[PDB]
């Protein structure tokens, strides 16, 4: 094998892991710190909640008798009622959203480049599986060897593997669905599509057969204590 | 019934959503849904192929392209069929 310098472990292997871990934490914390809710007026939240109610009605009107459901239908999408008809109305925001979307991967690539410069010329670890030779130019950046096994990796690709393998850990410790990783606007069209969808929907009162399906079995009663 | 008490009587704008009047108002798509990804996948595949040296210099882009339209479809084959 190869008698690698022990100091390469104490100053090039572990620091990379620590950097990746804390950079992920930093990135997640900066993401949550930067996020500020945009102010919403009454109309937008009102229409969003109205279409929410309409959709949940479409979803589960089955537990509601037919007349209540078709009265709901009349109220929402029907000329006479009026509802769903008389219900309608470098930029800073684009730059901000583009920067926010960019800051999820670009900092990682910049850190990788900085590491590649800072830690150029080493052999950090041997990958325990026989990688292909064609992957040599990128795994062994900063190494002048020619016949070296492809399983030996430079600092940059080791950092890349580290950053690839730590997202699950981030979700494990930081919390579920953390932001440290690598990866309605229009109501008129929404109104019309809700109109069409709830027009297409039908009714099936799920209570039409609850009694018969209840009479079959006795009521659970144990554990009353 | 000796306790058939009636509690109705006086009923007192109207709550929103309420309407007092009782109104009496009342292959195929799967082929297109399957052909959708069947036509979108070649577009990304063609883009990746036409990248040429750009794809070679972008090892992550090729993987992302092959995992977006393809791979994901194979992984979510059951989900695609159920949808």
């Amino acid at each position: 094998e190869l008698l690698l310098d022990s100091n390469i472990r104490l100053w090039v292997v572990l620091p990379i892991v620590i950097i990746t871990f804390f950079v992920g934490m930093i990135r997640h914390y900066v993401s949550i710190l930067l996020q500020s809710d945009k102010k919403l007026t009454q109309e937008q939240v009102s229409d969003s909640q109205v279409l929410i109610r309409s959709r949940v009605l479409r979803e589960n009107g089955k537990y509601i008798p037919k007349q209540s459901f078709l009265t709901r239908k009349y109220y929402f999408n029907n000329p006479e009622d009026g509802f769903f008809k008389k219900t309608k109305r470098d930029p800073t925001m684009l730059t901000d959203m583009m920067k926010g979307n960019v800051t999820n991967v670009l900092p990682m690539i910049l850190i990788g480049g900085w590491i590649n410069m800072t830690f150029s010329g080493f052999v950090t670890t041997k990958v325990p599986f026989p990688l292909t030779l064609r992957f040599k130019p990128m795994l062994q950046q900063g190494i002048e060897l020619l016949t070296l096994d492809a399983s030996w990796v430079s600092s940059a690709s080791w950092y890349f593997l580290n950053v690839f393998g730590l997202r699950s850990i981030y979700s494990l410790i930081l919390g579920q669905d953390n932001a440290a990783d690598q990866s309605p606007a229009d109501t008129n069209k929404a109104f019309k599509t809700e109109w069409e969808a709830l027009e297409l929907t039908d009714h099936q009162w799920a209570l039409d057969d609850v009694e018969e399906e209840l009479m079959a079995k006795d009521l659970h009663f144990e554990g009353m204590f | 019934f000796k306790w058939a008490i009636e509690l109705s009587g006086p009923g007192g704008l109207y709550p929103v959503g309420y309407l007092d009047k009782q109104v009496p108002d009342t292959e195929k798509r799967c082929w297109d849904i399957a052909l959708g990804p069947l036509k979108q996948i070649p577009m990304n595949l063609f883009i990746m192929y036409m990248a040429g040296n750009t794809i070679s210099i972008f090892p992550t882009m090729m993987v992302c392209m092959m995992a977006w339209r393809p791979i994901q479809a194979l992984m979510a084959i059951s989900a695609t069929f159920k949808m």
Partner: peptide, 16 residues
């Protein structure tokens, strides 16, 4: 960095 540019061009392709 040539590496940074060659690895950020796919980032721009992925975004677009």
């Amino acid at each position: 960095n040539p590496m940074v540019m060659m690895m950020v061009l796919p980032l721009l392709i992925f975004v677009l």
